Structure formats: C-alpha cells, structure tokens
C-alpha cells in the first residue's frame, strides 16, 4: 500500500578526503516476495552519480529522465554536468510533480571536476535538498543507516578506509531490514578513477 516500501532497498553516500563513496543493496521485491537480486539503484551521468530508492517503476523512470536531461545538457553546454548543478536539476524535476510525486529517495554523489571538492546530497520525494557534508541515507532501512553512519563515520577518510566504513554501514543496516539486502554494490569515486565493488552478504 505504502509506495515507498513495496519494492524495498537502500542507498547510502559518504564523503572522504578527495573522494566520495555511494552504495546500494540489490533487492527488488513485491513486499514479502523477493523477485530480483540484480536491481542496482546507483546510476551515473558523466562523473555525477545518482542513487535512487523507493518505488522501482519510478526509480527506473527517473533514471531514464535524468539520462535524457543530462544528455541534452551536455550537447547544449558542451560539458558534463557537475554534482551541484545536477542536485538542483533533481530538486526542480521532483518539485514539478509536487501534487503527484515520484515515490523515491534520491541521493547525488560526485566530485566537482573543476574545484576537486567532494559533493553529496539527498532529497525527499518532492525535492527538498538535504545538503550535508558527512553522509546521506535513503530507503526502507534509512533509520538503520542513520544509526550506523552516525557511529562509524568520521571526516577525511582515505578511499579504502571510507570503503570499509560505507560497506559496514550498508551491510549491518540491511541485515536489520526485511526488505533490503540480497547483495550490495559500493562505488569508490575519485577525481579520475572509479572503483565499483560487489559485496558478499547473507542472502535472506
């Protein structure tokens, strides 16, 4: 009934020293029924990454919509969109459905190519921006992720220190949620390399 918790799943993003990390679980379900364990929730438009939790048809629709918009952006501007600019684009796009919203929890992550500054952001379903330096969480185990992130996180982590932090935050939060898990992916993003790792986790 509640559209934000039919399909289930989570996204978390974090900042580190000259890097960001974004991670998601792999589950898609119909409430109790597990359907797919290959439903990734992180997408990318150039060097800007977008995680999306919530109703899966909207996750897919928004990905397709932001691919569309960022492609035209690049053709017109003659450069890839930056995280700061994209965040505003997401907010606009969500708010234009204010009274019939996409049932989603988006999370932006990336490094500004000019300034080199690590950037993350989050949104509610109607586009209000959570603009926090430390971490952004989303999904059916958001409470669990908030708890994990608040106790594990510290600023200015090196890429492989940050990997261990975000991974343990995701895994332990997911294992306390019925509708999250079934696998997980972690992107470690640096100014000119991106490392994508799939995690081994319990499959129940």
């Amino acid at each position: 009934s509640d559209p934000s918790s039919i399909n289930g799943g989570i996204v978390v993003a974090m900042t580190g020293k000259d890097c960001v990390a974004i991670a998601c679980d792999l589950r898609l379900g119909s409430q109790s029924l597990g359907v797919s364990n290959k439903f990734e929730k992180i997408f990318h438009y150039g060097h800007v990454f977008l995680g999306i939790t919530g109703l899966a048809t909207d996750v897919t629709t928004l990905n397709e919509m932001f691919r569309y918009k960022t492609n035209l952006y690049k053709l017109k501007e003659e450069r890839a969109i930056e995280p700061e600019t994209f965040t505003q684009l997401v907010s606009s796009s969500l708010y234009e459905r204010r009274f019939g919203p996409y049932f989603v929890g988006p999370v932006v992550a990336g490094i500004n190519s000019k300034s080199g500054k690590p950037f993350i952001a989050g949104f509610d379903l109607i586009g209000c921006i959570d603009e926090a330096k430390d971490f952004i969480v989303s999904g059916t185990a958001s409470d669990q992720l908030f708890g994990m992130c608040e106790s594990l996180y510290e600023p200015n982590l090196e890429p492989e220190d940050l990997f261990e932090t975000i991974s343990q935050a995701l895994l332990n939060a997911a294992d306390r949620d019925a509708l999250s898990g079934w696998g997980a992916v972690v992107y470690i993003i640096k100014k000119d390399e991106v490392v994508k790792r799939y995690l081994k986790m319990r499959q129940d």
């Binding site: 289930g8 029924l33 597990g34 499959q203 129940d204």
Partner: peptide
C-alpha cells in the same frame, strides 16, 4: 524460504 521470504531467515 529464508531466501525468498522477507520475514523468514536467520
């Protein structure tokens, strides 16, 4: 069932 059912496992 532990695998497929969200409310089963452990």
């Amino acid at each position: 069932a532990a695998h497929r059912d969200a409310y089963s496992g452990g």
